[model samples]
Target: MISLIAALAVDRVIGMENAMPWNLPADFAWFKRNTLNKPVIMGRHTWESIGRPLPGRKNIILSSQPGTDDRVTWVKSVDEAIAACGDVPEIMVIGGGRVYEQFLPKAQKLYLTHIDAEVEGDTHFPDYEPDDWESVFSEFHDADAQNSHSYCFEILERR
Candidate 1:
């Protein structure tokens, strides 16, 4: 089973120049909690945003100009990344627009944090039909002193 994890603002804004526009600690925590210890596949831009390979997971980079690193496996295509996963049943596709769009069709589960406010962004999550997915879990979190925005975590299973 392949899963995708992302946080998007109400307007469906996801990224601005390869980085997220808002700071949501809880959302970051949620992301780390779900994606840790799994194979994480991402595009070059997404990898650049993160700046380094996440410590505990295998980092698979989808890029035409393949690069090398002890901590990263540079794959030329999504199929190469998928094949690199080997026996891992659940791989997480963490994205920066194009990568998400490519894997959205094959994802079995989606873990999304829906931000209450809209912000400007150059990159966006791919559009999906709500009717084709079923929400299995949802929890709303209001903004507080530590967190800057109100958001809800939703888990959707492809129906």
Candidate 2:
């Protein structure tokens, strides 16, 4: 199953350059829960933001550096990323804008974190209407000391 894991604001704001703008621990915990034990595809910038392998999955990075590491498979294209995944049933496309834009059309499931507030963002998630997708799972979290804004986690199955 091909899926996308993204956290964006109500206005679809996702990033402020190479890094995410928020510091929500619960959201990050949610990310770990869903992405564990899967092969994940990420853009170069996303990889740079994370700075290392995500610990429990195969890391597939899209880059032209022709880099090779036991912890990561660096490829130049989407096809190459798939090639690097071997035979995994689930490939999680974890993104910066470039990776998200390219793989959004191909994703069958979307694990989305929709934050309530809009902040300044240099990078944005793609536009998609909720009515266009079927929500298979949904949960909401209120802002607390650890989180700056309220957020909803929705797992959508493409219609």
Candidate 3:
């Protein structure tokens, strides 16, 4: 099975560039615990932002063009990334916009962090109809006064 892990804004803004907008240590910790020991696939741009394999997870980067990075196992196609994953019960699709669109149809679940506020952004999450997914798990995390970024976390399954 395939899955997506993302943090987005109320207007579906994902990022301004390759990196994240907020600094939520808690969310990063949550991601590490949940995705550890799993294969995390990302597009070339996203992989460039991260710079290297994230600690314990196996990293597979999909790019239409060729690139080199020792920490990542790069592939020219999505099919190749899936093939590299073998029989792992689940693979995580970490992203930039285009990569999300490519994998969303085949992903079993989406782990979303929905910020209540909106910001102008260059990159956006893929737009999907409400009927495409079901909310199986939801929880809100209040932002501290300093962060000014209250948000909800959702575990959505393809319907």
Model 1 agreement with the true structure over 1-159: per-residue lDDT tens digits: 889898888777887434456678899899999989999998888787788789898999998985966579999988999999888879999886898898999999999999987676665789999998999999999999888889999999999
TM-score of each: 0.93, 0.90, 0.90
Tens digits of per-residue lDDT, candidate 2, 116-146, equal: 8767666678876667789999999999999
Strongest candidate by TM-score: 1
Give the per-residue Cα lDDT of candidate 3 at 35: 90
Model 1 spans with C-alpha error above 4 angstroms: 16-19
The residue ranges of model 3 lying beyond 4 angstroms of the native Cα positions read: 16-19, 145-148
Which of the predicted structures, 1 or 3, would earn the higher lDDT when compared with the native? Answer: 1
Q: How many clashes (backbone N, Cα, C below 3 Å) per candidate?
A: 0, 0, 0
**How do the residues 23-120 of candidate 3 rate in per-residue lDDT, one tens digit apiece?**
66667766787799999998887887876678778899998777677777889888999998889988998887899999988888999988777676
Candidate ordering by lDDT (highest first): 1, 2, 3
The models' CA-based lDDT, in order, is 0.87, 0.85, 0.82
Candidate 3, residue 128: Cα displacement in angstroms equals 1.7
